[PDB]
Amino acid sequence: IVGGYTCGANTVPYQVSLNSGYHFCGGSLINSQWVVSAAHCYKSGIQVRLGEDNINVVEGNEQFISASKSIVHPSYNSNTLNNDIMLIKLKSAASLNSRVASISLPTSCASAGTQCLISGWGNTKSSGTSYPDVLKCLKAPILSDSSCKSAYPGQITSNMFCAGYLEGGKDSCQGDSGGPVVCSGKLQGIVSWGSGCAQKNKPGVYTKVCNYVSWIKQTIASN
Amino acid sequence: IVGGYTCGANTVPYQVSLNSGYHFCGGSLINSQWVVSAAHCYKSGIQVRLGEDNINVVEGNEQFISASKSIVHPSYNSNTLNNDIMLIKLKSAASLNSRVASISLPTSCASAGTQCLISGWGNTKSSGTSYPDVLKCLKAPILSDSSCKSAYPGQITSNMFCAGYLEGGKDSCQGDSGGPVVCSGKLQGIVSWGSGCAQKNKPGVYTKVCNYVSWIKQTIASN
Amino acid sequence: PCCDHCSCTKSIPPQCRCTDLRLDSCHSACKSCICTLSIPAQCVCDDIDDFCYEPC
Ligand SMILES: [Ca+2]
Ligand SMILES: [Ca+2]
Ligand SMILES: [Cl-]
Ligand SMILES: [Cl-]
Ligand code: NA
């Protein structure tokens, strides 16, 4: 997260860290046994870490649960990043409390201009490299589909939306992938891709979650 | 056209050569005033050359008509080559005869396995460069959507289809772009793109014309 | 600046694009670089040239 702020310990109780020896992506807890992340974050041997603030210090509220199964979307396009969504099932159900809580799936898509909360442990610098240890937060509006395609001509699909500021300065960055974009208490976006971080005319692109509620519900009900 | 044969003079009376000082693309005559080509073939100062066989000798059946207007498809994507179709209006109506005739638009989309005729003045070598002067023809079947996407994972849209042979040896090549793919007397495809020419598991990709009959009809009716 | 999967249009000149996915792919030999925000990042170059680079 570039140009954001420190969330505060466990103020984003649905934010999870995906660990394979190190934090490589974020994720969103949707129930006690399932996490939503980005399909491009897929790798074997994922450990889901819930209740995290400082990812480098055990602070007493963490839950480390190994993944039993990862399910990349059946139409995930690694060339264009279309359908960049992945489901992760936990080997054991997490203990839902105040610091570990699920986030609701959307019943309707969000409109342009809606303020959303983007969080993650990604790089905090637009030019350089500095990785935080506590969770960083960012309030960013959803940009119109027209301006999103205007920023990335020929690369935006109906399953992606842009969020942030065309003047740059505030954006998600390397390490934030798979993380949540929550608008009005609903998980509307997944940190997907971009061109650099916090660059002018290069806002972050996010997986449009509201187009996958049907596939998410049926998949977890059968797995 | 690689691995094809000499069509014979004016045996493809809808085949067009697009000239801007030289042959750079092909096209298909759909009525006396309109030519269908590929959107990536767009350039200014197009001259439409009908009735051509040998494109370097005036043989007595040609008609050279300047383009009055070019209309790239409103959703053409130069990055993904989706909606790679373009309409070219002739400055004056061509006189239709046996050697200059229009090709019918499709009423329904062609199915996989249908043998089609592909023609053009493109390169005839898969590893090398030798451009012919008379028109070359190639009979090639339409490949299934699955095998087309299998050849180019993450790049075949619903507006494209593959045609040719997965073993290679027969394909379209540089210079055939915008040219016709005619199946059962209907213009079903436009020579679009590929990975090399006549390569194993790299068949030619073509614009699925049947998804554009509505746009083609309304555009020429209002231009 | 190699490239293993090169797709070109069949025009004169051809319009070619490299579809390689690399963990850096953001050379100065790439004008438009697109990366995922993961660790490592998966980057693609959507530049359009009239040629294809040698393989890797
Ligand atoms: Ca911790
Ligand atoms: Ca001639
Ligand atoms: Cl070629
Ligand atoms: Cl339209
Ligand atoms: Na006319």
> Domain holding A145: CATH number?
2.40.10.10
CB distance C44–A79 less than 8 Å?
A: yes
- Shared-domain flag, residues B23 and B78: yes
- CB neighbour list of residue C49: distance below 8 Å, 6 or more residues apart: C16, C17
- Shared-domain flag, residues A22 and A122: no
- Shared-domain flag, residues A53 and A86: yes
Whether residue B150 contacts residue B77, with contact meaning beta carbons closer than 8 Å, is answered with: no
* C9: nearest CB among B23, B152, B192: B192
Please give the residue of chain B at the shortest CA–CA distance from C19: B155
- CB neighbour list of residue A41: distance below 8 Å, 6 or more residues apart: A18, A24, A25, A27, A86, A177, A178, C38
Whether residue A165 contacts residue A197, with contact meaning beta carbons closer than 8 Å, is answered with: no
Whether residue A179 contacts residue A191, with contact meaning beta carbons closer than 8 Å, is answered with: yes
- Shared-domain flag, residues B112 and B52: no
Find how far residue B179's CA is from the centre of its chain.
2
Structure tokens at B152: 């180019």
* B155: nearest CB among A79, A154, A155: A79
Cis-peptide, bond into residue B106, ω within 30° of zero: no
Cis-peptide, bond into residue A153, ω within 30° of zero: no
Element (H, E) at A220: helix A213-222
Structure tokens at B204: 């030619």
Q: Domain count of chain A?
A: 2
- Shared-domain flag, residues A205 and A124: yes
Q: What is the largest CA-CA distance in chain A?
A: 47
Whether residue A12 contacts residue A137, with contact meaning beta carbons closer than 8 Å, is answered with: yes
CA-based nearest residue to A198, from A137, A104, A144, A123: A123
Q: What is the domain range of residue B76?
A: 15-102+212-221
User: How far does B188 lie from chain C, in Å, by closest CA?
Assistant: 18
Structure tokens at A166: 């065309």
CA-based nearest residue to B181, from B130, B125, B128, B105: B105
Phi, psi torsion values for A210, nearest 5 degrees: -60, -15
d(CA A119, CA A141): 14
| Model resolution, angstroms | 2.2
Q: What is the CA radius of gyration of chain B?
A: 16
Phi, psi torsion values for B220, nearest 5 degrees: -75, -25
- Shared-domain flag, residues A120 and A23: no
Check if B171 contacts C (Cβ < 8 Å).
no
- Shared-domain flag, residues A77 and A172: no
How many CA atoms within 13 Å lie on the side-chain side of A113? 0
Question: How close are the terminal C-alpha atoms of chain B, in Å?
Answer: 33
Q: Is A73 a catalytic residue?
A: no
Pairing of strands A23-31, A15-19: antiparallel
Check if A74 contacts B (Cβ < 8 Å).
no
What three-state secondary structure class fits B121?
coil
- CB neighbour list of residue A151: distance below 8 Å, 6 or more residues apart: A162, A166, A201, A202, A203
Residues of B belonging to the active site: 40, 84, 177
Put simply, the chain A residues between 176 and 205 with a CB less than 8 A from any chain C CB are 176-178, 191-197, 204
- Shared-domain flag, residues B173 and B92: no
CB distance A155–B79 less than 8 Å?
A: yes
CA-based nearest residue to B54, from B62, B46, B65: B62
- Shared-domain flag, residues A62 and A118: no
- Shared-domain flag, residues A121 and A203: yes
User: How far does C35 lie from chain B, in Å, by closest CA?
Assistant: 16
Q: What is the largest CA-CA distance in chain C?
A: 40
Structure tokens at A40: 């491009």
Check if A157 contacts C (Cβ < 8 Å).
no
CA-based nearest residue to A25, from C22, C54, C39: C39
Proximal ligand: closest to the CA of C51: 3
- CB neighbour list of residue A103: distance below 8 Å, 6 or more residues apart: A14, A28, A29, A30, A180, A182, A185, A186, A187
d(CA A131, CA A122): 6
Whether residue B45 contacts residue B83, with contact meaning beta carbons closer than 8 Å, is answered with: no
- Shared-domain flag, residues B110 and B81: no
DSSP, res B134: S
| Residue B210, Ramachandran bin (φ over 0: left; ψ between -120 and 50: alpha; else beta) | alpha
Structure tokens at C29: 């030999």
What three-state secondary structure class fits B210?
helix
Check if A24 contacts C (Cβ < 8 Å).
yes
Degrees, nearest 5: CA angle B95-B98-B101:
60
Element (H, E) at B141: strand B136-141
- Shared-domain flag, residues B108 and B193: yes
Whether residue A2 contacts residue A198, with contact meaning beta carbons closer than 8 Å, is answered with: yes
How many CA atoms within 13 Å lie on the side-chain side of A120? 35
d(CA B207, CA B179): 10
E-assigned strands of B8-85?
A: 15-19, 23-31, 34-37, 47-50, 63-72
Structure tokens at A222: 């059968």
Whether residue C35 contacts residue C43, with contact meaning beta carbons closer than 8 Å, is answered with: yes
